[PDB]
Amino acid sequence: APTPVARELKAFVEATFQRQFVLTLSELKRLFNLHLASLPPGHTLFSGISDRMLQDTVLAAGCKQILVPFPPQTAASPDEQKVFALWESGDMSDQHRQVLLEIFSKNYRVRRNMIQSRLTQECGEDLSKQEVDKVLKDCCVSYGGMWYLKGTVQS
Amino acid sequence: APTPVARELKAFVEATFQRQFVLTLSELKRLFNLHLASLPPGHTLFSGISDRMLQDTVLAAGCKQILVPFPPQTAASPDEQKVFALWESGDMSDQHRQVLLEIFSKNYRVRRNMIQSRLTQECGEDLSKQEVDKVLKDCCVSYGGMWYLKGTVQS
């Protein structure tokens, strides 16, 4: 079957705006071409990607167009005048920490997998290794293969 | 001393939990004593601060007590068994960015002071230079003493 483009575009747009926050369509297209250089031949993003699809991906990913009023005599191109910005950053680190703390309301120590499973069940199956690693680094210490809240191990 | 006790203690507790996330009372007291070592004689925080007031300040700041079930045979002291945790970061990055972005919906370029004043008016005087510097670094570029959204200067 066909290999759809939307998820691949979204991953690129999300990485780009989380890093840079504000950029023009011109810069987004430049960065997209650099992204293409990293992809293997046969990838779906080598064909049939319009500027419209890129803009729709930006708006689908919690970014907004900022209607900056360029001066009358500007030489900036249309793409150089179209400005997008990260609106909501989507950092759910507070919520992950709250789920972990709820575990330790009922447990002194647990396996990593128990934490991962609880987070996945509560917060979503797309939870990343980086997000779990962060909440563990912030809140916990491991001893003997078990995970404790910081400062609660008595070795 | 020159400043109010609870206000000063609250500032210390907030900064400490934003850095450490999870602390026992024992560890919080250790960190407090390290803090006192840095302060000038006559500072209000050399006043008697009871453990109860310290805990009350943590709880009043929005940190939560975590009722971790310590094992029956633990040798942890009572203060080592009282666990507290940051519930919300207080990261207001998105809101500051949205204030700034609305400035550039009506302006191509502005002075830094204009952005600062707008942030102060919308958020309040409780914006650290660190937050203002961050929102400027994330969204903007300076050229000739004026501030623009990233990517919009025709350099």
Author numbering:
A (entry chain B), B (entry chain A): 554 to 708
Sentences from the paper on this structure:
Pol III is a multi-subunit complex composed of 17 subunits. The TFIIF-like RPC4/5 and the TFIIE-like RPC3/6/7 subcomplexes are Pol III specific and can be regarded as built-in general transcription factors that play a fundamental role in Pol III transcription initiation and termination. A notable exception is the subunit RPC5, which in metazoans encompasses a long C-terminal extension (RPC5EXT, ~450 residues long), whose function is currently unknown. The RPC5EXT is formed by two consecutive tandem winged helix domains (tWHD1 residues 259–440; tWHD2 residues 556–708) connected by a 115 residue-long flexible linker.
To gain insight into the structure and function of RPC5EXT, we determined the structure of its individual domains by X-ray crystallography. Of the two tWHDs, tWHD1 is the most conserved while tWHD2 is absent in Caenorhabditis elegans and Drosophila melanogaster. The tWHD2 structure revealed a dimer formed by domain swapping. This arrangement is likely caused by the crystallization conditions and, in agreement with this hypothesis, SAXS data showed a monomeric conformation as the most likely in solution. Nevertheless, the two possible conformations of tWHD2, compact or elongated, suggests a degree of flexibility within this domain. Thus, one possibility is that, analogously to A49 tWHD, the RPC5-tWHD1 participates in an interaction with the upstream DNA and bound transcription factors, thus stabilizing the human Pol III PIC. In addition, the Dali server analysis retrieved similarities between the individual WHDs of RPC5EXT tWHD2 and the WHDs of cullin and cullin-like proteins, which are involved in ubiquitin-dependent proteolysis. On the contrary, RPC5ΔtWHD2 and RPC5ΔC were rapidly degraded with RPC5ΔC almost completely depleted after only 2 h following cycloheximide treatment. Several abundant phosphorylation sites have been identified in RPC5EXT, which, together with the evidence of structural similarities between RPC5EXT tWHD2 and factors involved in targeted degradation, suggests the intriguing hypothesis of an RPC5EXT-mediated layer of regulation impacting overall Pol III abundance in response to environmental cues that may have evolved in higher organisms.
